[PDB]
Enzyme design. Structure first.
Site, PDB file in Angstrom:
ATOM      1  N   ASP A  54     -12.698  15.441  58.759  1.00 44.46           N
ATOM      2  CA  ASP A  54     -11.616  15.552  57.777  1.00 44.46           C
ATOM      3  C   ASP A  54     -12.074  16.090  56.414  1.00 44.46           C
ATOM      4  OD1 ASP A  54      -9.260  15.359  56.393  1.00 44.46           O
ATOM      5  OD2 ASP A  54      -9.217  13.163  56.306  1.00 44.46           O
TER       6      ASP A  54
ATOM      7  N   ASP B   4      -7.224  21.043  54.258  1.00 41.24           N
ATOM      8  CA  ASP B   4      -7.123  19.691  54.822  1.00 41.24           C
ATOM      9  C   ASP B   4      -7.104  19.667  56.348  1.00 41.24           C
ATOM     10  OD1 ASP B   4      -6.774  16.985  55.260  1.00 41.24           O
ATOM     11  OD2 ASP B   4      -4.752  16.896  54.379  1.00 41.24           O
TER      12      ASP B   4
HETATM   13  C1  LIG Z   1      -7.200  11.391  54.110  1.00 42.54           C
HETATM   14  N1  LIG Z   1      -6.151  12.345  53.750  1.00 42.54           N
HETATM   15  C2  LIG Z   1      -5.136  12.078  52.903  1.00 42.54           C
HETATM   16  O1  LIG Z   1      -4.954  11.048  52.245  1.00 42.54           O
HETATM   17  C3  LIG Z   1      -4.280  13.347  52.765  1.00 42.54           C
HETATM   18  C4  LIG Z   1      -2.839  13.060  53.246  1.00 42.54           C
HETATM   19  C5  LIG Z   1      -1.784  13.998  52.623  1.00 42.54           C
HETATM   20  C6  LIG Z   1      -0.368  13.476  52.936  1.00 42.54           C
HETATM   21  C7  LIG Z   1      -1.939  15.449  53.143  1.00 42.54           C
HETATM   22  O2  LIG Z   1      -1.931  13.988  51.199  1.00 42.54           O
HETATM   23  C8  LIG Z   1      -3.164  14.094  50.594  1.00 42.54           C
HETATM   24  C9  LIG Z   1      -3.235  14.500  49.241  1.00 42.54           C
HETATM   25  C10 LIG Z   1      -4.494  14.622  48.603  1.00 42.54           C
HETATM   26  C11 LIG Z   1      -5.689  14.342  49.315  1.00 42.54           C
HETATM   27  C12 LIG Z   1      -6.951  14.437  48.682  1.00 42.54           C
HETATM   28  C13 LIG Z   1      -7.095  14.043  47.323  1.00 42.54           C
HETATM   29  C14 LIG Z   1      -8.359  14.105  46.686  1.00 42.54           C
HETATM   30  C15 LIG Z   1      -9.492  14.552  47.410  1.00 42.54           C
HETATM   31  C16 LIG Z   1      -9.348  14.933  48.769  1.00 42.54           C
HETATM   32 CL1  LIG Z   1     -10.709  15.469  49.668  1.00 42.54          CL
HETATM   33  C17 LIG Z   1      -8.085  14.878  49.406  1.00 42.54           C
HETATM   34  C18 LIG Z   1      -5.614  13.935  50.671  1.00 42.54           C
HETATM   35  C19 LIG Z   1      -4.356  13.815  51.311  1.00 42.54           C
HETATM   36  N2  LIG Z   1      -4.985  14.243  53.669  1.00 42.54           N
HETATM   37  C20 LIG Z   1      -6.004  13.634  54.173  1.00 42.54           C
HETATM   38  N3  LIG Z   1      -6.920  14.176  55.050  1.00 42.54           N
END
Ligand SMILES: CN1C(=O)[C@]2(CC(C)(C)Oc3ccc(-c4cccc(Cl)c4)cc32)N=C1N
Ligand code: NI
Ligand code: NI
Length: 402
Positions: free
Chosen positions: A232, A36
């Site tokens: 991202d 991430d």
């Molecule tokens: C936008 N974004 C989020 O919402 C987030 C925020 C964070 C608190 C780390 O939690 C998550 C958890 C899962 C996903 C996920 C869930 C499914 C597919 C994908 Cl690619 C990611 C994305 C995130 N990290 C990000 N970059």
């Protein structure tokens, strides 16, 4: 220029993120960890949850230390929370090193874990500024660089799926590479172009021009970066600010007008299908984002295809058809270059030199007529400032930074 041991070390299910295998604790406990670049905490499931087959068991690690501080992270749809600690961490298909890193042991969460994604934690690769509870919690990559001789750089090759698909009952498998500490030349072809990291918090960049099928959207370029533009890996879609989104959709609709799709399709809420192998790729336009170059008044463009922005989803009911989700969506928090962008390219997060590199990915999906492209330079005499300055709140202004 060759890192065989780290090639093909990423896995996932389409739309559910790319993960890398990591170990935590002594002896090593293996977990699958979402990669991430949009966040900055290393946070792993550390208690039973219905969607977890396994979790970090702190009591089984001789090297675990409790930091005696909690952490709470809400977001749009829910939250994760837990207890801060440190332990030994490694990446089995990564550099041959073990580091002591901060680990947030997730003890409670809401709409965080996803049934079937096969990941149990998240590796926040962005900078300390956006770490929780605050910027004094050193992110994993910072610890890795400080504790070892690993160069301050990583690169990502995200390889998306395409038809024909193997399975009707499960989502398509995806693969990729995270090269830690270097650039592997087998993962790209042609020129590698760099755009500056505007500020080290998210991986923030500046877009100076947007074209849809060769045609300039002709907007004030600040609109493209309102209120930021970021790269991202933790976002699936290409997400665009409202005004840019509406302009882009209008253009894509116009180009593809021989096909009359329901409103649900353009909202990303409904699949559209063609008979197997007959998808009319040529009616959908290419999208070019011009990014600020390292040189004043230069830019380069990254160009993606409908093969990147139309995501394959195999329908159980219509497994004989090729069905797609539209993966460009509206944002109120700026441009997000997610998997839709990244699957076209080998992306170099050159932290040492405060820049992000793009080259055509050796694994991108294309056809015989068009390819994802990275092209430049483009020179613009007296190029404007396309960056947006986020209004400063009193709360953030009040922080001291000692
Ligand atoms: C936008 N974004 C989020 O919402 C987030 C925020 C964070 C608190 C780390 O939690 C998550 C958890 C899962 C996903 C996920 C869930 C499914 C597919 C994908 Cl690619 C990611 C994305 C995130 N990290 C990000 N970059
Ligand atoms: Ni293994
Ligand atoms: Ni002070």
């Amino acid at each position: 220029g060759s890192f065989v041991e780290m090639v093909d070390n990423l896995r996932g299910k389409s739309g559910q993120g790319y993960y890398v295998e990591m170990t935590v604790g002594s002896p090593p406990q293996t977990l699958n960890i979402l990669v991430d670049t949009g966040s900055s905490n290393f946070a792993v499931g550390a208690a039973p949850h219905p969607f977890l087959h396994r979790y970090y068991q702190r009591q089984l690690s001789s090297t675990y230390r409790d930091l005696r501080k909690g952490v709470y992270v809400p977001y749009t749809q829910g939250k994760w929370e837990g207890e801060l600690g440190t332990d030994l961490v490694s990446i089995p298909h990564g550099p041959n090193v073990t580091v002591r890193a901060n680990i947030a042991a997730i003890t409670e969460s809401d709409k965080f874990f996803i049934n079937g994604s096969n990941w149990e934690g998240i590796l926040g690769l962005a900078y300390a500024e956006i770490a929780r509870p605050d910027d004094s919690l050193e992110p994993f990559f910072d610890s890795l660089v400080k504790q070892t001789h690993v160069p301050n750089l990583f690169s990502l090759q995200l390889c998306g799926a395409g038809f024909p698909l193997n399975q009707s009952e499960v989502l398509a498998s995806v693969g990729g590479s995270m090269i830690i500490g270097g650039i592997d030349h087998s993962l790209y072809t042609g020129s590698l172009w760099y755009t500056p990291i505007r500020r080290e918090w998210y991986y923030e960049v500046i877009i100076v021009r947007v074209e849809i099928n060769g045609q300039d959207l002709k907007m004030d370029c600040k609109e493209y970066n309102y209120d930021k533009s970021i790269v991202d890996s933790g976002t699936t879609n290409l997400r665009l600010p409202k005004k840019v989104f509406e302009a882009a959709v209008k253009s894509i609709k116009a180009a593809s007008s021989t096909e009359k799709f329901p409103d649900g399709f353009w909202l990303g809420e409904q699949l559209v299908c063609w008979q197997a192998g007959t998808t009319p790729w040529n009616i959908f336009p290419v999208i070019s984002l011009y990014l600020m170059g390292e040189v004043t008044n230069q830019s380069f463009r990254i160009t993606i295809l409908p093969q990147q922005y139309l995501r394959p989803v195999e329908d159980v009911a219509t497994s004989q058809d090729d069905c797609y989700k539209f993966a460009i969506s509206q944002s109120s928090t700026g441009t997000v270059m997610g998997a839709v962008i990244m699957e076209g390219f080998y992306v170099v997060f050159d932290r040492a030199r405060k820049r992000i590199g793009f080259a055509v990915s050796a694994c991108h999906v294309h056809d015989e007529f068009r390819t994802a492209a990275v092209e430049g330079p483009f020179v613009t005499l007296d190029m404007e400032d396309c960056g947006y300055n986020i209004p400063q709140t009193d709360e953030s202004r009040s922080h001291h930074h000692h």
